Amino acid sequence: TLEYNANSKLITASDAVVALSTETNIDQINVLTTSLIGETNPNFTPQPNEALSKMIKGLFESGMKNLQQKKLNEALKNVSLAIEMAQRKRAPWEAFAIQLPELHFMLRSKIDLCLILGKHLEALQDLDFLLGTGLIQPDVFVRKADCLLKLRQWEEARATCERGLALAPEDMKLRALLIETARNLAEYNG
Amino acid sequence: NDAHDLYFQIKEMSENEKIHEKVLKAALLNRGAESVRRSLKLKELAPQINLLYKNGSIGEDYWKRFETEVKLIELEFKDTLQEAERLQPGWVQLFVMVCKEICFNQALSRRYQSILKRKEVCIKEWELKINNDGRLVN
Amino acid sequence: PFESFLPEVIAPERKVPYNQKLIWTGVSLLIFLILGQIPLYGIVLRAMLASNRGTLLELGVSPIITSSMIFQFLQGTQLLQIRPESKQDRELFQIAQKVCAIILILGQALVVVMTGNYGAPLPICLLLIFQLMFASLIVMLLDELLSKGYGLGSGISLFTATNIAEQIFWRAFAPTTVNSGRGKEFEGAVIAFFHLLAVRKDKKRALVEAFYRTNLPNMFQVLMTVAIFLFVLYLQGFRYELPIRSTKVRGQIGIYPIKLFYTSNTPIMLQSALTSNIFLISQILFQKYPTNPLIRLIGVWGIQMALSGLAYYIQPLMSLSEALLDPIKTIVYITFVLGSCAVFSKTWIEISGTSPRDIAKQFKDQGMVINGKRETSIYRELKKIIPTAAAFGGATIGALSVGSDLLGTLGSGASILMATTTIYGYYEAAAKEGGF
Amino acid sequence: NYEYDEASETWPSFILTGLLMVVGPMTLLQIYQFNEEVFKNLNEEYTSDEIKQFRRKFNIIIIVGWILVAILLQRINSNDAQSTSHGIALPRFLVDGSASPLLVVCYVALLGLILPYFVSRWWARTQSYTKKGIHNVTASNFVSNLVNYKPSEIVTTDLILHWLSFAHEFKQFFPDLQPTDFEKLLQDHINRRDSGKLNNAKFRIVAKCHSLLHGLLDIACGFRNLDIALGAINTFKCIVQAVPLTPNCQILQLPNVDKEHFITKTGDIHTLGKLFTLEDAKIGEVLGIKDQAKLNETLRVASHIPNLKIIKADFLVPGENQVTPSSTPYISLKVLVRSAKQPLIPTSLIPEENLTEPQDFESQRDPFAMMSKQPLVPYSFAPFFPTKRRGSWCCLVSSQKDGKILQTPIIIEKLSYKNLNDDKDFFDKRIKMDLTKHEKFDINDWEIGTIKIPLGQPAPETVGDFFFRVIVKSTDYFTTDLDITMNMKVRD
Amino acid sequence: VEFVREGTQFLAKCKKPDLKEYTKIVKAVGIGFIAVGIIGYAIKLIHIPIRYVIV
Amino acid sequence: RVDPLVVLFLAVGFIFSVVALHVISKVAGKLF
């Protein structure tokens, strides 16, 4: 079953245990309802909003400003808040070809900052998402193999370097990464 | 495992408890997005199933079942679109593109949400010793 | 062209494995063999054990064979104008097969039941018609089933090979006896051998008495037919393998086998049909007119073997005694049958579209070439291979038939050759495809 | 009309001949009637009794024919004995006595009941199984599992065990248990735990999992999915060796070690080469067993499992010298089965004779005949698997532009393990004295195996370099596998 | 006599079967021949007393 | 349109029907 709130207009399943599909569908319906309550015009167009994009850009600029001032802690926080706001306060029916590249452009800077700071697992997961969602470039496999070497996974690092060289065989950093991976693996087996 | 019956449940709840009007539109858009997603999935999976069947590795009844589901999805989409016409006057030309976009948007949203759970499985599998601030302590 | 909704077995959507194929073949064969041993209902030694006369298999496969040959002749004479570019005229020809076969079955059943010896006096006649119609339709459906893909091959060839093997085995292991004055003697070879060896208690005499047996089958014929079977099996593996390579998609290398038995049992069949027809014609002509110069010249029939006639000159030799009796008849008959087989094989390869020119055309179409030779010489290379193969295959088939009829085997060389070819086809297909 | 045997004077001879033609050949045929396996003895010394008992639990016709022949011959010899009169050999009471309706009723029964029922049973039984060897419901479940598979969910061993626990072939064995019980039994097997009462069912389903995992791998390669295929191979390894997947597993698959000591004491030994780097007694002191008669067995097991290594790999087309557009090439690998104890032999020392392909028509018409002539792989050392298995290597090829498996996996079974024998024990890693310049080292004694994989798809019609990825994994041990990339230079 | 010479020249270049292949050939073909012959003979023999009793 | 089992059943049914007709006629002639 499922109960319907009155003042918040949010649907919640009052059952003891629920499946995962039911829960994610109820969450999607809640998101769509919270968007429709806010958007006024009944015949809404897939055209993106303006004030939300302005706020997101302002937050991302305030986060990028701290790099020039050499504060690598609050810059990452501001970038994370910008990404969270972009993923939270944006209606689902907005243009996908405009909603995806902004996420890519902010996630790239977040990845660079997390890699420079010292966090490697978060950066590795961000690289994996960014590569599985449709972005394959030689500037991705370099960083992915870097993380996989920093947290000591040598077979995956070698496979990543090989797949990176199978796309841009003229690269000068993937070759050094492959040399280092081969050395570490030969010390690992011998 | 679908969002088809959840809209009907919300509809029967509205017929009794006088819920708002936009919840119906939300459930309808969700059902339309799911129908579009399933149609694209079947359109992309058809050749591999055909090859598995021709090679003799899937059976004889599953092929008929797949061919039946192919048109069951179209019937469901037509019913959803008729209901969209019934719910709002002149909302059939834009409903399709709205669903076409919310499908991709919510798929991307789920893919991005899954990384928090994806991050701990690798810790458990590789036996990492991660302290606070995400650094390694060997 | 027209619309027809006739019962037909649908082909499997996927390739059937070998075990199911073998089991379906065996089951269909068992059904066909059981169907031909049950007599009709209303009809009024055995007199029905030798031939399938008086059973539900009266017509048998005869209407199917007649429809096949008449439509094959109509296709060969180029009056249908078939074009393989369409996938509808083929189905039209296939349904023409059946619409001719069914009406031929109806006509033949009517003629047999209204003229045959079953009896002129309505319900009994209707039942006798329905039995034959249902049996022939069952046989046709079973052949179609075996041909659609559920069986190892065609149905007619399997049925003929089964009949041949059954006759060969019944001539040797027949439990029936014959009592003519002296006593009861088994009509088999091995059965009578063991019987005369056990009960007579005179082994030295019983061996010669059961080994020759001028009046009934004996053991010498069994040994001779086993030897001829082994030799025929040996001459089936002969093949000329010339190397070919592809030019469209490089990396496709193989061989093209050119067998020795290139015509594969056809010229001997043509020769046998011609000889039977001319012998029957001469016999009927001698029956009609007692004495005439030309009729006395062609053949003088007497006690039925004609004497001092051309039919006598072309009459086959049953044993070595007749051969030694008149050397001229042998030295004419051997050369006649060998030359006829060779000429028939050559004409058949020239007619049936298997001439070296057509093979060269197929090679040019597929894009293949010969390994160590050029492109403009495939025809000149096939001309030096295929005609000699066909001629010598025909000559060898004729010589095998002559030797088999001379040594006095349990079955003629033509029937053993047909059965061996039919079974070797299944064996070669199973080996090439791969199956248990 | 026929005349049936009235005085029993003809049918004895017929039955005697019928019996002889069957007895003679059978008696005649009764009168007429490459790879060293080192683990065949050491496997039966470590298998527990509960598995031995399970594997244990789960000519008279000639003599009777000769006695019947003797009886028939005695009866024949004991007997007393113009137009033609035909007769039959069968006795008279069979057709004219009181047993006349019995013959026809038995005929009608055997024709109408036994034939159609048995034929229908055989047809319904053969129409239910898949060409691969698994049920139709199991294949349907596997396809339905891979259809709605969220790509965000990461594949593990627990996921594939959960998928396996829904096989229909597990229900025919024990129609009382539930899929949760099957998953619990599989977890108990992998974690080396005791079930108490369902051991005879655990062993059964664990021995059955072989065909199920092979079919799942086939279907996953058919759907062009690499992660699920790799997970299936790893799960097969874990099921065979009875060990959960961890980083230091090549050293935990050994027969007699204690994890509570090795894990907590050492933390840098993860492979077998790193283990054989240490001395002879240091290995025992690290693994914590301190028993020489018991240390020699584990050292004989650890130095006899095969590791691979490439010598030369390229795309070859039969009858040409290069790859051209729309041609049909294949893959040619020259591997070297080595032990974890031997040092590396340089590729330059190979005399180049074993690496070249013969150029002859009989050799280039079918390039797999030379591969099909190698000896089989010996029996593996798996004391916890119920049945007895042979080794195997599952090789699958994928692409590098997108990362999708593009053909079903080839499974090789013939390979030569000559380099693992005990006569080449001088070639040890701890001597560090450049053992290539040794008195016993002859580079013509080391065997170089070959692996040929048909590509199944022709070369692209364009011109350029196209990269692939070949993976050759084992299915029994946790050894060193192959993972190489190679490109075909379509040059026209 | 030239025809026999060409025939022998063709027979020379042919590919005769060896012992290992001829054994498989004779085994398979003999098995098939016996399998069809025994079935035909048994069906022909069984139906004599049945056809006596029934008809 | 028609399956192999249908053909087998048709054949066995026709054969058994003919045999049953024979034996029924024989028994009827023997009794009366």
Swiss-Prot record, chain A:
GO molecular function, one term: protein transmembrane transporter activity
Gene Ontology biological process terms from the UniProt entry: post-translational protein targeting to membrane, translocation
Subcellular location as annotated: Cytoplasm
Matching InterPro entries: TPR-like_helical_dom_sf, TPR_rpt
GO terms under cellular component: endoplasmic reticulum; rough endoplasmic reticulum membrane; Sec62/Sec63 complex; translocon complex
Keyword Protein transport found: yes
Keywords: Cytoplasm, Protein transport, Transport
Additional note from the record: Present with 5290 molecules/cell in log phase SD medium.
Described function: Acts as a non-essential component of the Sec62/63 complex which is involved in SRP-independent post-translational translocation across the endoplasmic reticulum (ER) and functions together with the Sec61 complex and KAR2 in a channel-forming translocon complex. A cycle of assembly and disassembly of Sec62/63 complex from SEC61 may govern the activity of the translocon.
Subunit structure, interactors included: Component of the heterotetrameric Sec62/63complex composed of SEC62, SEC63, SEC71 and SEC72. The Sec62/63 complex associates with the Sec61 complex to form the Sec complex. May interact with protein YLR301W. Part of a complex consisting of KAR2, SEC63, SEC66 and SEC72.
Name of the protein this chain belongs to: Translocation protein SEC72
Gene source species: Saccharomyces cerevisiae (strain ATCC 204508 / S288c) (Baker's yeast)
Encoding gene (name): SEC72
Swiss-Prot record, chain B:
Cytoplasmic side: 1-138
Membrane topology: Single-pass type II membrane protein
GO terms, biological process: filamentous growth; post-translational protein targeting to membrane, translocation
Record carries keyword rRNA-binding: no
GO cellular component terms, semicolon-separated: cell periphery; endoplasmic reticulum; endoplasmic reticulum membrane; rough endoplasmic reticulum membrane; Sec62/Sec63 complex; translocon complex
Subcellular localization, as worded in the UniProt entry: Endoplasmic reticulum membrane
Keyword field: Endoplasmic reticulum, Glycoprotein, Membrane, Protein transport, Signal-anchor, Transmembrane, Transmembrane helix, Transport
Keyword Glycoprotein recorded: yes
Family listed: To S.pombe SpBC409.21.
Subunit organization: Component of the heterotetrameric Sec62/63complex composed of SEC62, SEC63, SEC66 and SEC72. The Sec62/63 complex associates with the Sec61 complex to form the Sec complex. Part of a complex consisting of KAR2, SEC63, SEC66 and SEC72.
Note: Present with 7820 molecules/cell in log phase SD medium.
Function: Acts as a component of the Sec62/63 complex which is involved in SRP-independent post-translational translocation across the endoplasmic reticulum (ER) and functions together with the Sec61 complex and KAR2 in a channel-forming translocon complex. A cycle of assembly and disassembly of Sec62/63 complex from SEC61 may govern the activity of the translocon. SEC66 is required to attach or retain SEC72 in the SEC63 complex. It is essential for growth at elevated temperatures.
Official protein name in the record: Translocation protein SEC66
Swiss-Prot record, chain E:
GO molecular function: protein transmembrane transporter activity; structural molecule activity
Subcellular compartments: Endoplasmic reticulum membrane
Predominant location: endoplasmic reticulum
Organism of origin: Saccharomyces cerevisiae (strain ATCC 204508 / S288c)
Family of this protein: Belongs to the SecE/SEC61-gamma family.
Any one biological process term the GO annotation gives: SRP-dependent cotranslational protein targeting to membrane, translocation
Keyword annotations: Endoplasmic reticulum, Membrane, Protein transport, Translocation, Transmembrane, Transmembrane helix, Transport
The protein's name in its UniProt record: Protein transport protein SSS1
Role noted for this protein: Part of the Sec61 complex, which is the major component of channel-forming translocon complex that mediates protein translocation across the endoplasmic reticulum (ER). The functional states of the translocon complex include co- and post-translational ER import, cotranslational membrane protein integration and retrograde transport of misfolded proteins out of the ER. In the cotranslational pathway, ribosomes synthesizing presecretory proteins are targeted to the translocon by the cytosolic signal recognition particle (SRP) and its ER-localized receptor.
UniProt GO cellular component terms: endoplasmic reticulum; endoplasmic reticulum membrane; nuclear inner membrane; rough endoplasmic reticulum membrane; Sec61 translocon complex; Ssh1 translocon complex; translocon complex
Topology class, membrane: Single-pass membrane protein
Extracellular topological intervals: 51-55
Transmembrane segments: 22-50
From Swiss-Prot, chain F:
Transmembrane segments: 4-24
Signal sequence, renumbered to the chain: none
Record localization: Endoplasmic reticulum membrane
Entry similarity comment: Belongs to the SEC61-beta family.
Protein's job: Part of the Sec61 complex, which is the major component of a channel-forming translocon complex that mediates protein translocation across the endoplasmic reticulum (ER). The functional states of the translocon complex include co- and post-translational ER import, cotranslational membrane protein integration and retrograde transport of misfolded proteins out of the ER. In the cotranslational pathway, ribosomes synthesizing presecretory proteins are targeted to the translocon by the cytosolic signal recognition particle (SRP) and its ER-localized receptor.
Self-association and partners: Component of the heterotrimeric Sec61 complex, which is composed of SSH1, SBH1 and SSS1. Presumably three to four Sec61 heterotrimers assemble into an oligomeric ring with a central aqueous pore. In cotranslational ER import, the pore diameter varies from 9-15 A in a ribosome-free resting state to 40-60 A in a functional state when associated with the ribosome. The Sec61 complex is part of a channel-forming translocon complex whose composition seem to change dependent upon different functional states.
Protein's UniProt name: Protein transport protein SBH1
Gene: SBH1
Residues of the full protein shown: 51 to 82 of 82
